[PDB]
Design a protein around this ligand. Structure first.
Ligand SMILES: [Mg+2]
Ligand SMILES: [Mg+2]
Ligand SMILES: [Mg+2]
Ligand SMILES: [Mg+2]
Lengths: 376, 370, 376, 370
């Protein structure tokens, strides 16, 4: 079974807005990858658009796809190694190639599930199990504290035992917001926080004590992805709340650097970013030996959501699934929906591969838009 | 003076080969950045193609240019900041965005020198001085040791006091090559080595002692850019030959990470890769306090070469300039040749900005190939 | 364009007093540097008097000026390197030479701005932007806590969102003072503290908890500039308030030593002390990679105030400008004033060089006085 | 007994040259400090000029003397403290103030020995003993290797068992010099080396192994005084030859910083630079617990030489005395010659205080030059 065609299909959706630390969201983009085989089996993956989806599309169509055509379709380790030496190790696009191979790998695993007649959790050695979820996605953004509390109440009513508050616009206001949410929900809900790379160190030494006071589960991404000196300096503030990162981190080599720095104790690789399922396993296994929980970051599509839940089912040190709960996200319920149970958990689809049926006539409903996706 | 237009112009050339540690070269690519201003002054830069020139071009035109139109063209610090917060810090393309800003930033400093009526060395605070150079680029590749020695002798005859040997294919064959060159050039030539990310650790503990024996200037890029664990292990082998890295390292935050690892003691940023001249200064200033020499890596075009020499003339802790000496390279001589003197040195051009005049009719001679 | 003449002009002013950790201020001194070029352009800088202004004057006129006459006037990097090898590296005056070259460098950059027809922020690559300021200078010294509160209220009325309280006479009294100021101003004002090298370690372990309680922005200079073991030992007290230093620190080499000690996380180089603008950039860039904010220390004259604001406009990791607010400081408003806005910010002058016009007939109004400047 | 007058007397001498790592010597300068008391006893010291003798003189007369007039002349600890809090700790001149207090402090100990009717070694708690010496000062500079060897042989014939070779101009030429001296003197002479802050790291990893090969006593000052990062890197090269530093290091707080860096294992304070005899004791006492030898650096005048020998006789962990052996140096023999014996050693004078009589009519013979 050889690889015949690899195609990157860029999709986008314009909405009539939720403010985070990265700015204000005006447009949602997604890149869906199709890999065709010699024996007729077709696999589907999702690559992250990287705030410039035309570039990842081009990178696949011009460089990465030709180096993988003709390869055996189950050899995703060998497929990953070609991208590693031609792009990741030297003179390449670095992080952009990781995004590109992430979707391809994901599609190759979908082929591998279909060829073995196994769902992905079974292919990886796990079982169909209940995986805890929190209300995340592009929701719970910057708004008055009482309105933010009401949105949080809506999610517990929907069965969530955990939620992720978006912080990082000003220390004072999100101290005020974070305190009010604990006040109205009680101390039974795992309140998680995400600063989305927007805090300084001065902000952190003000916010971290109140996070320990409200007993938050983690502080996610307080600084820039490459801000190494700030990441080691926050660890010194409080041991009662761990630092979380991984969304903007690529390959096991970047995660290995944050392993022996020892500051970030909660890892969140996005399978549409980090290098795919193959690299996801490698990252999680390193974390496993050091007892670090994997709370995977989720991308836009229900394809990535399928791959993530399958991955967490077979990953021993899996923590949370990040569930998108925003009302204006069509990529989530694009084909065959995940659904949260009353136990606060989620389940992988019981069908070969990723267990998602892809009708290609939905791509026409969400065409490519060349504009920017963010407002700061 | 505001920014009006930013365009990325892809150029490529097919050669009818020199093998290094990354592979075999069949086609050279380059991306030239044109920045137009509201007062008629036009800047030029080089962005590294990153093995996919169509992707960086797409990234510039769709994303990085729209966020920079309307900015004051002298504000390169602010221009770098917008790219830092929109692309480099969060959900962007990471390393690819750094290549894209590198050329734009270089073109911004070109505008700024012309508007100030100063050459770039003068703009950066330096003076026109002789900068030592080594014979490098896509030259001195894998070949028999006596043929490699004949190529080496030709560069000393042209004036060079230093050269860079390509190692990394097989441990035995490049120990054999490296020892032979020392005997035929004597111990007066600074012999530098580049492994082009092709060594393992098992190779390194076999090769490093002979590099000490021949008193090599540095071992450049023995491992992949993100291979942190190997880089810290090779520093334990010998203190007599330092490790060099920088080509595949982007922003001062990645260089900052290898500062406190302490393993790499020779920093080699590429101004067409690391973030431009702006980030080049910041990387070099950090190295300056730690007495780490900046031996900048050179890209394809004579634009990048001009910018690098201008940079090193004003940079306090500057080491060598990497001189491209392969003669199947039209990008170097594309618009008015650097020239190596009998002192083995090189001079910055004494004209406003980068000191290079760009005729756009030459772009048609080298069309873009996928 | 060559250098023709370098002249150090010592100035002083006697006042009919504000008490700090360095003692009681009775006389203010300043050294203004004039550099003349071959092409008629004249630049102006400020060197710190170093508590013995006759010595810096002598050092310039006898040693440093002759080694720089004939040099190209835009080659300030090369000018700095000559002073580095002849004075800073070996057998020299060390810190005194740094003060001397600071003013000369500053004057050379003023020439460079005028020759390029650019203001200094534009020459360094920045833009005209709003830079936050705090009430500093020789103000808010030792006095009864209620009178100290009234002086603080006057500055917020003048638009300051931040201020620097002078501490360090006794632990008990400035704990009492610091608590009262937070009480009357609310927790919206960034209260900064400066001990002016006067604390012991025993004082620090008493004062630092109350500073964390009142959430102070930093503790500036608790010990002697060379007191390395005390600087690393205070870092162990509280992570909620960082230690600040740099006023009495010279060259990037002394700042590099405090970088890898890792204790001081807020850097304050004085451009009239550290080695000038050239060295200022080098110090700030090292801090930039490690995400350390530069909150530059200000000297006496409006020349240094111009150079500082220009420097902070083009410095990416710039924090605060230290604004002198003392009523008896004529050096500040000596020629063409800075003015604080309602946003709590300050702006660089929009004119070539430092943007300050120097009338030399004001030097006669402030002649040199040979006496001491401090009382302890 | 109070302090009445403190005066700084600048002296200089033009020579019609010996090249070291800092440059070429054309004129030697010295500053002599006279401290008068209310009971008629007068002390003398030497302050280092710091390449600008007019500045230190100005600093003493305008600032440091006014803060010390009226103090009890035996209270040198309190005298050092006033200078510490007024000049060294905060907004002062830093390193220059340390040079200024060094001579005053030395003159204070001169008064104190005379008032106690004890020589300084006895005042410090030691006894008159033979102290090993090496041939140094502005001697054994850059010259052909055989001419350098002839100068070396002359010092062994005079009695010396140790000498200090000036290296640092070029790595090749001083490897050549250092090897030649070992062969012509044998392995019985302690060969010490001084680079005078002129090496890079690339030079060091080429030179250090040959210094190990020739079994050199130490490598003195390879880098600038504040070049912290290089000093920690050279300790990694070879454990067989230690690094020496101290000439350009002031107060026990800078020596304390190089204690916990662990890189420099031979400390060389200058009593005319580091803070005087008072600070000299404190620097040496810290070194004593860590078993670091104190091989003090010598200044210009025979006053400083007298103070140094007195100091080392009473100092537990004293190593070598630096003997100035250049014969174009009148400051050494200015008022009654030290003398080297056949044991290669040197003795402190057996007279109250520093044991030197100062005739002020000799000051006219060496007037001050700008
Ligand atoms: Mg996130
Ligand atoms: Mg290379
Ligand atoms: Mg202060
Ligand atoms: Mg010496």
């Amino acid at each position: 079974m050889k690889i015949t065609k690899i195609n990157a299909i860029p999709l986008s959706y314009r909405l009539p807005t939720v403010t985070m630390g990265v700015g204000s969201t005006i447009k949602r983009d997604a890149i869906i990858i199709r890999v065709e085989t010699s024996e007729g089996i077709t696999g589907y993956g999702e690559a992250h658009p990287g705030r410039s989806p035309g570039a990842i599309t081009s990178l696949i169509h011009n460089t990465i796809a030709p180096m993988l055509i003709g390869m055996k379709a189950t050899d995703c380790v060998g497929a990953w190694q070609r991208v590693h030496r031609m792009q990741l190790s030297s003179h390449g696009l670095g992080a952009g190639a990781a995004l590109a191979i992430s979707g391809i790998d994901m599609a190759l695993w979908d082929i591998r599930g279909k060829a073995a007649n196994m769902p992905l959790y079974e292919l990886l050695g796990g079982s169909k199990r209940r995986i805890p979820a929190y209300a995340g996605g592009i929701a719970l953004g910057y708004q008055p504290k009482e309105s933010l509390a009401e949105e949080a109440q809506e999610y517990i009513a929907r069965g969530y035992k955990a939620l992720k508050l978006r912080i990082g616009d000003a220390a004072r206001v999100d101290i005020e917001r974070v305190r009010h949410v604990r006040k109205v929900l009680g101390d039974e809900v795992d309140i998680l926080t995400d600063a989305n790379t927007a805090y300084t160190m001065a902000d952190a030494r003000r916010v971290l004590p109140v996070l320990a006071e409200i007993q938050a589960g983690w502080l996610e991404e307080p600084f820039a992805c490459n801000d190494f000196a700030s990441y080691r300096e926050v660890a010194k503030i409080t041991p009662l709340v761990p630092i979380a990162a991984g969304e903007n981190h690529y390959t096991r080599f970047e995660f290995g650097q944050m392993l022996d720095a020892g500051a970030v104790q909660v890892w969140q690789p996005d399978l549409s970013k980090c290098g795919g399922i193959t690299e996801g396993i490698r990252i999680a296994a390193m974390a496993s030996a050091y007892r670090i929980p994997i709370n995977a970051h989720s991308s836009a599509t229900g394809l990535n959501h399928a791959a993530t839940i399958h991955f967490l089912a077979a990953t021993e040190n899996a923590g949370y699934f990040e569930a998108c709960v925003s009302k204006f996200n069509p990529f989530r319920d694009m084909f065959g929906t995940f659904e949260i149970g009353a136990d606060g958990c989620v389940e992988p689809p019981d069908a070969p591969g990723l267990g998602i049926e892809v009708d290609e006539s939905i791509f026409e409903k969400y065409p490519a838009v060349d504009g920017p996706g963010y407002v700061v």
